[PDB]
C-alpha cells in the first residue's frame, strides 16, 4: 500500500502565526492528495482536494501545494478554532491516510477556577462516594491536584480527566475524582482538594465538611 | 447541503457480524458523480478506508479487510450499509459513512461525512446504562452531573435539552477498575440564576437504549 | 464479439462475465490482459456451491512493475478502483469446468474522451 507520512507529529503555535505541515507519499501520487481537519469529537472535514483546491466554504487562510511525493498544508494566520488534527490522504492506489499532525495553540497563562462537589446522598446508597474537584479554564495543561481527608494526603484512589483545548479561548478544564467507600467517607469530616498551577501564586484549596 | 447519519449497535460480540446503516438526506443516490463510502478510525490504526459503492451497486473494497466487509445500497430509502463479518477486538473503532467525488484531475475525495458511530467489539455480556448523580452548586457558580457505571462507550450529555451550551465542559470517560465507565459534565452559570433557572442534564446512552434526565439543584 | 466498456479517468470499472455454473463442478477462471499502450493477470479456482470460497492460484506482477494496483479478482468479475491509461485494452475471461466446459468472454475497455 502507499504509506503516507506527516511532519511534525504535533506543533504548538501562537494565534496569528503561519504554520506549514508536511505530507509525504511513499510513491508518486500525482496531485491526488486531500487534506482533512478533525476537531475534538467531530468527523474529519475536507479542507483541500487535488493537492491545492480549497473546498467551498473553507477559510482562505488554508492553502495546499505539491505534486508527486511532497505536499504542504499552510495555515497562514492561525486562529484558536484551528486547534485540530490535520490528515493527508492519497487517491492514486488503495485509499490511505497519513497519521495526522496535531496543532496546539499557545496562549497566555490562565489560572484555574476551582470547585469541589461532595458525594450526593443518592450515590451513598450504593456503598460508594465520589468527591469531585473541578479545575476550570486554565492554561497551560500542567497542574497538580492533591486530595486531603482530615489533612491526610490521599494516594492511589483518585482519577483525573482533562478536556481538549477550548476552540474559542484555548484553555483546558480538568476533573479529579476521589473514590471512597461509604464507610470510609462516613468516618471522616474534612474533604479538600488543593490545586497547584503556574498562574496561582500559592496553591488554592477548596474544602467541604460532612461525612 | 447533503447530510449523512450513521446508526448501528455500539456493542458486538467477537465472531459476530457488525452491521451499520448510513441514511442520506439532502440528496439522492442515483449518479456516477458520487460514490458512497465507509471509513473507520481507531486510536491505534488511524483512519482506514473500508470501501465504497456506486449508485448502480458496484462495490470496491480495501483488500486489508480480507473481503470481510460487504457494502450494500438501497437507493429507494436513500440508504447504504456496511456488514463486517467475523469481528475481533481489532475492529473496535468509530465508523463513518461519507460521500465521495472524483474528477479526471483530482481522483477521489470525501467531501461530506457522517458524525461517526463507535462500535466496541467485546465478549462482555450485555451493555449497561448509567446512573446519574447531581454535582450540586454552592459571582459564577458551577454545577454538573456525574454519569457513572455504564458500558460500553459512549454517552452524550446535553443541558436543558440543548438550550444551554455556553460554559459546558464534558470530560472524557475513564474506565474504572470495575470494567465500567464514568465521566462528569459541568457547566458554570450566574449564581443569581440558581434560584430562578432550572438545570437538567440529559444523558443519552445509545448502546443500551437508555436516556436519563437529572435535575440538579442546590442542596438543602 | 466484444463486450465494450467505456471508462472515464479516475472512475472505477467492473467487468462482469455472463457467468453460469453447475452445482458441484470445479471451475478455474483466468483473466488475461492485452494492453493498448497474453499476460495472464490472474487465475482462481473453486468448487461451485458471496458465500463462495475460492483459491487464488496465480497472479501477475505487471501493474506492480508500473507502481499501480492490479485488478481485484472475484468469481465472474474483475474490478479496477481507479481508471488510468494503463488499464485500457482487451481483457479475456476463460472459465473451465470439470464437466468439460470452457467458456470465453472478451471485453474492450476504452477511454470515453477519445471519440470514434
Residue numbers in the entry:
A (entry chain L): 1 to 211
B (entry chain H): 1 to 138, 145 to 226
C (entry chain G): 140 to 176, 212 to 223, 228 to 294
Anything the authors wrote about it?
Glycoprotein E (gE) is indispensable for viral replication and cell-to-cell spread and is the primary target for anti-VZV antibodies. VZV gE is a type I membrane protein, is the most abundant viral glycoprotein expressed on the surface of VZV-infected cells, and has also been shown to be the primary target for antibodies (Abs) elicited after ZVL vaccination. Critical for many VZV gE functions, as well as for VZV neurovirulence, is the formation of a non-covalent heterodimer with glycoprotein I (gI), an interaction that is conserved among gE homologues. Results: The 3D structures resolve distinct central and C-terminal antigenic domains, presenting an array of diverse conformational epitopes.
Attempts to crystallize gE_sub bound by one of our Fabs were unsuccessful; therefore, armed with the gE_FcBD structure, we designed a new gE construct that initiated at the subtilisin cleavage site and terminated at the first visible residue in the N-terminus of our gE_FcBD structure (Gln305). Expressed alone, this construct (which we called gE_gIBD) did not form soluble protein. However, when co-expressed with either Fab 1A2, 1E3, or 5B3, we were able to recover gE_gIBD:Fab complexes. Crystals of the complex between gE_gIBD:1E3 Fab diffracted X-rays to a maximum resolution of 1.9 Å. The structure of gE_gIBD reveals an IgG-like fold composed of nine β-strands (β1–β9) and two α-helices (α1-α2). The β-strands form two distinct β-sheets, which are folded on top of each other; β-sheet one includes β1, β3, β4 β5, β8, and β9, whereas β-sheet two is formed by β2, β6, and β7. Additionally, the stretch of residues from 177–211, which is the expected binding region for gI, is not visible, suggesting high flexibility. The structure reveals that Fab 1E3 recognizes the face of gE_gIBD that encompasses β2, β6, and β7, utilizing both HC and LC CDRs to bury ~1050 Å2 of surface area. The paratope/epitope interface is dominated by polar interactions, and several arginine residues from Fab 1E3, namely, HC residue Arg67 and LC residues Arg30 and Arg93, recognize large negative patches on the gE surface. Though the 1E3 HC buries almost twice as much surface as the LC, the twenty hydrogen bonds between gE and 1E3 are split evenly between each, suggesting that both chains are critical for binding.
